[PDB]
């Protein structure tokens, strides 16, 4: 399986970017396999 990379752009902030998404506060746990899960 040929896995390869291609450049897609500069690392830059864009002034006129679309803005969206909320800002949830969540209690989570991180297990040994790197999986996050919700905690109550």
């Amino acid at each position: 399986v040929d896995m390869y990379i291609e450049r897609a752009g500069d690392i830059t902030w864009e002034k006129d970017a679309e803005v969206t998404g909320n800002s949830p506060r969540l209690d989570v746990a991180l297990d040994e396999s790197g999986d996050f899960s919700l905690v109550e």
Partner: protein, 148 residues
């Protein structure tokens, strides 16, 4: 080797992820490559450091990205969607509260092939990578940053 954001492809071709080239080191999420060597033109990038729990991997050298979310300001996801040009999405992160401290998190739900896309602060520094998270139907991604 040029600094920038890159697609991670496999072979028809499919985009499995995204990564960041900085200071000669390629940075992506472990689950994107599972540590496999990467082709870059005629050259080969070999894995250098990786950690399944952090879900991170670096190629050609140690992890170089060390900026962190300031906990107050909006950030930008520099997404590279499969089949589309790189584009920026601005958002205010939420928070993952863990027993080991808080982690910034972005409530943005984009195609799996965007995993590894960088999240930036206002100065253009990479504060982490997108694509390891939880579901609350909506996906929320940790802002995953390594250690330099």
């Amino acid at each position: 080797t040029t600094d920038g954001v890159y697609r991670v492809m496999t072979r028809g071709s499919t985009q499995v992820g995204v990564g960041v080239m900085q200071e000669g080191v390629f940075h992506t999420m472990w689950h994107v490559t599972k540590g496999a060597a990467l082709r870059s033109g005629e050259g080969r990038l070999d894995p250098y450091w990786g950690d399944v729990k952090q879900d991170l991997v670096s190629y050609c050298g140690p992890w170089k990205l060390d900026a962190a979310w300031d906990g107050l300001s909006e950030v930008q996801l520099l997404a590279v969607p499969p089949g589309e040009r790189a584009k920026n999405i601005q958002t205010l992160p939420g928070i993952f509260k863990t027993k080991d401290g808080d982690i910034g998190a972005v409530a943005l739900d984009y195609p799996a092939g965007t995993s590894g896309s960088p999240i930036l602060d206002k100065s253009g520094r990479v504060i982490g990578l997108y694509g390891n998270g939880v579901v609350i139907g909506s996906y929320v991604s940790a802002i995953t940053q390594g250690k330099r």
